[PDB]
Amino acid sequence: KNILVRMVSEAGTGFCFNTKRNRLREKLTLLHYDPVVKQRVLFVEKKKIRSL
Amino acid sequence: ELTFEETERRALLLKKWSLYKQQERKMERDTIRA
Amino acid sequence: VENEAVAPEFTNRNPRNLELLSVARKERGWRTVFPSREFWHRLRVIRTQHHVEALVEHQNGKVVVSASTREWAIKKHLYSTRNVVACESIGRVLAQRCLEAGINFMVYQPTPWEAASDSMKRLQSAMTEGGVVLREPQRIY
Amino acid sequence: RRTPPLGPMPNSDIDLSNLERLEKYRSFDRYRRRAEQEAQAPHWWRTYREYFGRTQQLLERKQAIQELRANVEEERAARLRTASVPLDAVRAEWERTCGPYHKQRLAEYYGLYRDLFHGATFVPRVPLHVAYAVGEDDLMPVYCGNEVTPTEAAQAPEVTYEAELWTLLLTSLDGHLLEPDAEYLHWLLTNIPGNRVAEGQVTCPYLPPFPARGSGIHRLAFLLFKQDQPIDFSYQLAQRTFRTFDFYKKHQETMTPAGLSFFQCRWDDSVTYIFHQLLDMREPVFEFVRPPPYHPKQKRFPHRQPLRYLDRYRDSHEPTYGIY
Amino acid sequence: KNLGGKSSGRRQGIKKMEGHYVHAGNIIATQRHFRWHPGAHVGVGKNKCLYALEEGIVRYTKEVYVPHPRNTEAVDLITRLPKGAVLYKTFVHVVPAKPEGTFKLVAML
RNA sequence: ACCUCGGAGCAGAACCCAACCUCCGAGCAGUACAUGCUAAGACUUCACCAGUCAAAGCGAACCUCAAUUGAUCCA
RNA sequence: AGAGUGUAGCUUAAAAGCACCCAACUUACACUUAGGAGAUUCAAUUGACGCUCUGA
Numbered sequence A: 001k002n003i004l005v006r007m008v009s010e011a012g013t014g015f016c017f018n019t020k021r022n023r024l025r026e027k028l029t030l031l032h033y034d035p036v037v038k039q040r041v042l043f044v045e046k047k048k049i050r051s052l
Numbered sequence B: 001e002l003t004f005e006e007t008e009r010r011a012l013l014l015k016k017w018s019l020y021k022q023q024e025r026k027m028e029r030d031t032i033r034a
Numbered sequence C: 001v002e003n004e005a006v007a008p009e010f011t012n013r014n015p016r017n018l019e020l021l022s023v024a025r026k027e028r029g030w031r032t033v034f035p036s037r038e039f040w041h042r043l044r045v046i047r048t049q050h051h052v053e054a055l056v057e058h059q060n061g062k063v064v065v066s067a068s069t070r071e072w073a074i075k076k077h078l079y080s081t082r083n084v085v086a087c088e089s090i091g092r093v094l095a096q097r098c099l100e101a102g103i104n105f106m107v108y109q110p111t112p113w114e115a116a117s118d119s120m121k122r123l124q125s126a127m128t129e130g131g132v133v134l135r136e137p138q139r140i141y
Numbered sequence D: 001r002r003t004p005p006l007g008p009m010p011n012s013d014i015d016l017s018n019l020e021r022l023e024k025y026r027s028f029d030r031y032r033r034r035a036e037q038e039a040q041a042p043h044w045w046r047t048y049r050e051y052f053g054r055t056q057q058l059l060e061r062k063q064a065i066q067e068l069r070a071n072v073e074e075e076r077a078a079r080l081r082t083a084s085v086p087l088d089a090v091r092a093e094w095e096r097t098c099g100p101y102h103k104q105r106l107a108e109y110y111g112l113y114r115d116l117f118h119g120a121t122f123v124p125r126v127p128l129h130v131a132y133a134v135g136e137d138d139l140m141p142v143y144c145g146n147e148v149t150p151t152e153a154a155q156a157p158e159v160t161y162e163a164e165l166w167t168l169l170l171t172s173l174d175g176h177l178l179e180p181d182a183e184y185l186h187w188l189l190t191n192i193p194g195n196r197v198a199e200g201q202v203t204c205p206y207l208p209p210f211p212a213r214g215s216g217i218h219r220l221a222f223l224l225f226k227q228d229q230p231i232d233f234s235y236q237l238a239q240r241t242f243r244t245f246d247f248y249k250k251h252q253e254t255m256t257p258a259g260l261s262f263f264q265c266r267w268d269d270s271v272t273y274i275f276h277q278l279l280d281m282r283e284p285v286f287e288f289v290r291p292p293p294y295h296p297k298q299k300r301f302p303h304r305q306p307l308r309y310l311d312r313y314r315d316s317h318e319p320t321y322g323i324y
Numbered sequence E: 001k002n003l004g005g006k007s008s009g010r011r012q013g014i015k016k017m018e019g020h021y022v023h024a025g026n027i028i029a030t031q032r033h034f035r036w037h038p039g040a041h042v043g044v045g046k047n048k049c050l051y052a053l054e055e056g057i058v059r060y061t062k063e064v065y066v067p068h069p070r071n072t073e074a075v076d077l078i079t080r081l082p083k084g085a086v087l088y089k090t091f092v093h094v095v096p097a098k099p100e101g102t103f104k105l106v107a108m109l
Numbered sequence F: 001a002c003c004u005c006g007g008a009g010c011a012g013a014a015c016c017c018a019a020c021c022u023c024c025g026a027g028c029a030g031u032a033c034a035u036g037c038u039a040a041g042a043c044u045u046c047a048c049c050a051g052u053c054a055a056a057g058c059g060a061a062c063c064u065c066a067a068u069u070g071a072u073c074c075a
Numbered sequence G: 001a002g003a004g005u006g007u008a009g010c011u012u013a014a015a016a017g018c019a020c021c022c023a024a025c026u027u028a029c030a031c032u033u034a035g036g037a038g039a040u041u042c043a044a045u046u047g048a049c050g051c052u053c054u055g056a
């Protein structure tokens, strides 16, 4: 099963996007495009919105 | 390591074996058909 | 001034006018078929049993330029007409012919194995160093 | 209903119960070759093309090939993938042997024949070497359809056609500013005595190319006619207008097109100087105008359409207030 | 015992037959499988729907089928095809009507 | 017993077609993190709601999947 | 003695395309890449050098 997690930008911007990951996998870090910064920046999982 | 002369000799060896076995296969096929 | 009489709309009849301006249409379809028709000029390489052919062909099918190792001029200067040396030489000849023909951009559409082929790599490098870019400019809409 | 086919259906002759015995395309390459051949072959059904469409020489060549094979160093380099080819010699031999045919192909592609001669073709048997002198040091050659700027083409070119009575004509095919089906004559040297060109009769003085700005790429053709017997020929644009088809219709009996060389030119500052000083006119500036975007007839109630629907049809972006 | 099967028809098929003037972006035909393959100036959506990439006249033709070399299933089918056999498919083309544009005299400098 | 969704016949060929008719399935999973932003023109499950495809452009690089879901209010 | 006559294996090809072989990948084949040899029988459409058939 998977869970929905809010990945939050490490760029200081309050930009958050929701993704899905396995409940049994480590906390998730991606390089996602930040429209506020107009550049790909690191996003780190912060919270689990719901389990899907 | 190897040298240019022996590489050339090997290439000519491949050439002559190509010709030889080409003739071999041609004669084999000729006997087959005949 | 009589010389100043100019028609309101100009009619440039050169077939390569819009192609050089990067404005002509290039067939964008055929997404389920190979090769793609989305080009103005295509570099087509045919490796026969004995010879090597290199054509620069417009999308309409006209063979704008050709370079064959079957021609005396080229075949009288190389040992084998079906090897990497032959492919590189014919590629350089085609590059010179393209530059003198005014063709500077093309779209090469090789199969995976043809692209991996050493002879095709040598031919592409020969064209590139001769001054032909194997990547046509994007159309301007 | 089943209407019978109007001809041989594809894959009909081969189809037979002996599929296992029949050999198969083991290679995408051979399948593609066969498919391309079939596509080129004509068909009775609607197709894409319908809508969008001596012995001494052999002996000498065989001896030369045998000599090249015997030369060990040649084989050494060939097998070491290091051999090269003399590009200049290849070019000269191409000119001598098969250059005329490829040049004819280039002319047909560029549409010279369909415009200069209304479709009538001719092989340029006699090579034509034209080059515009750049500076006092170098010179840009005009091989076939290559690009030469009007700045380079400002002064008349040097022509060296190897032969032993000729007429040379420079014709701009699409530079006409008033008539779509018309030409410009830039210089016409008639009754040229062989190789030397300076002795030709200057029927019309040399006028540098002047492709209008934003008017696209223009093509310029050097037509060389062998003259069987000498014949007499007959800055104002009205008289620089020309029709090569009619000219060759008049002079066909005594003229035969034996040389051809053309190049492409686009606008340059020398074109501005040509227009203002030589021609004494306001230079025309052209722009590529695309057709206006298509929009469906505006509906009173654009159901499910975005708010941009009204913007698609409003002409002025500035606010308007009607009676107020 | 038999449940389901209440789905309605997709209303798929040809939206523009041959000879129909079609504007850029118009959907020509919607299909579940590749019944009609994309021809010249015809693009395919994610759901295999054919849309006109240009403004022109729709034409249906039969053309030889040469799949991309990386289309493994079609390449295998070809490899198993007997010599002399050529696949044919129905292609949809949009013959553009208007030219890309015209050169107009804008300023007599 | 069933109630929603999808595929195949009935419904052979543009579309659409009932049945407490015949059969299969779904209420995910996987990969990616530009799976971003915009925008012509179209399709549309016979209404609406909803659902689809997408040129060009910006910004970049140089989604698979038939269904795989649920409005408003309110939290 | 008479007839058909005649491009490397095949070509209502005109010095070409298919064929064909080994080297590597394959157990192997196949594919692919690298290479390989190859012919218009001889003299002026005609005659005579080679093959097939009809006889002794």
Ligand SMILES: [Mg+2]
Residues within 6 Å of the ligand: E005, E006, E007
């Ligand atoms: Mg049904």
Ligand SMILES: [Mg+2]
Residues within 6 Å of the ligand: F044
């Ligand atoms: Mg509807």
